[PDB]
Design brief:
Layout: E1 4-10, E2 21-28, E3 34-40, E4 50-55, E5 63-68, E6 77-85, E7 98-104, E8 112-119, E9 127-135, E10 147-155, E11 158-165, E12 175-181, E13 191-194, E14 202-210, E15 216-223, E16 235-240, E17 252-253, E18 267-271, E19 279-283, E20 290-293, E21 302-304, E22 315-318, H1 321-324, E23 326-331, E24 342-348, H2 349-352
Antiparallel strand pairs: 1-24, 2-3, 3-4, 4-5, 6-7, 7-8, 8-9, 10-11, 11-12, 12-13, 14-15, 15-16, 16-17, 18-19, 19-20, 20-21, 22-23, 23-24
Protein name: Exo-arabinanase
Organism: Penicillium chrysogenum
Length: 353
């Protein structure tokens, strides 16, 4: 791999509906190939889908290889995709099964349904596997009951889906939860992970990375007034060595040594590069820079430059090559952007950390 800056994965046609693209997610397959997807705001009918673009040259070039269509509901696979190559067998699904989770939503935004698709051929073909969790109207207003934003992680023969939940609307504006499965078909009960006792609090957007000491780094945006008249979405994290037990961990505000206060839609990854504990790398949805931590989340975070533009839930990935030397930084644009596109940069962590 090499350093790359602002490579276009997809530039949408102007007849796509603003924002046209949003919400980048990606995966690296064991052979090193990179896959990318996003919310694809094509005019309907037919129903929206999640496109799957591949790079076989470490991000230099990209080509569409498949599309994940809403074969289960016919509504459209509309919001919040997530790609995940299983690192171990789960039930009847071998290691290397490629999963997509994402939300099936009708055009009228009346409902949400996080569904799970699988591919056994590295993203060429797809089949519906299960519903994970369904809810109400797909708008982030209090009193509504949607579900949102799946994140998938396997551990001990199980798959965990973390997501944001508005269904307990009598008690919380929003929570984050998870469900677990040992077969991808049958999901356990909803487990509350992050809840707060002020109704107007809206923690959301869970992203997890495993650390080399066995702790899991669980990052989220914490929407709150914090007792003031002004709402914000600062980044918080919880640390636990049990990825199914988050509620018992106190939240920790991410503090940056420069004084930048990162907000919205985090993403976190870990590389072995940078020191004896490696480096945790975090993005927000608001800042173009990156935030790093060489002490497993202790102390303060160092803000570093980044050549990729800022964007909503900008996605990070530590590529496997050379033992974690290269970082993908992948944007799909800004909220309600008039000129969104899907792009990627690759940074050489040997040099930038």
């Amino acid at each position: 791999p090499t350093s790359l800056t602002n490579v276009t994965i997809f530039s949408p046609p102007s007849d796509y509906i603003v924002p046209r693209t949003l919400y980048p997610r990606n995966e690296q397959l064991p052979n090193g190939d990179l896959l990318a997807t996003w919310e694809n705001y094509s005019p309907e009918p037919p129903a929206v889908y999640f496109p799957i673009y591949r790079s076989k040259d470490h991000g230099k070039t990209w080509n569409e290889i498949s599309r994940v269509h809403d074969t289960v509901n016919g509504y459209g696979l509309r919001y919040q995709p997530f790609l995940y190559s299983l690192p171990e067998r789960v039930g009847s699904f071998k290691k290397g099964t490629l999963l997509l989770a994402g939300s099936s939503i009708p055009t009228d935004l009346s409902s949400t349904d996080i569904v799970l698709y699988a591919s056994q051929d590295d993203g060429m073909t797809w089949d519906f596997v299960s519903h994970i969790a369904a809810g109400g109207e797909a708008r982030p207003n209090n009193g509504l009951t949607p579900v949102w934003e799946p994140f998938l992680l396997a551990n001990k023969g199980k798959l965990i889906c973390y997501y944001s939940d508005q269904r307990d609307n009598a008690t919380y504006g929003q929570t984050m939860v998870h469900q677990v499965t040992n077969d991808l078909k049958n999901w356990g009960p909803v487990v509350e992970d992050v809840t707060y006792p002020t109704y107007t609090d809206r923690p959301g957007m869970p992203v997890v990375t495993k650390l080399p000491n066995g702790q899991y780094f669980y990052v989220y945006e914490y929407g709150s007034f914090f007792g003031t008249e002004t709402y914000s979405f600062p980044l918080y994290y919880r640390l636990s060595s049990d990825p199914e037990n988050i509620a018992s961990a106190p939240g920790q505000r991410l503090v940056v040594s420069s004084g930048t206060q990162p907000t919205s839609s985090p993403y976190a990854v870990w590389t072995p590069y940078g020191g004896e504990n490696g480096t945790i790398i975090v993005s927000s949805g608001t800042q173009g820079t990156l935030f790093i931590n060489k002490a497993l989340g202790e102390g303060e975070w160092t803000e570093i430059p980044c050549p990729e533009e800022h964007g909503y839930t900008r996605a990070l990935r530590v590529l496997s090559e050379d033992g974690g030397r290269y970082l993908v930084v992948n944007s799909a644009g800004v909220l309600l952007g008039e000129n969104n596109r899907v792009s990627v940069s690759v940074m050489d962590l040997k040099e930038v950390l």
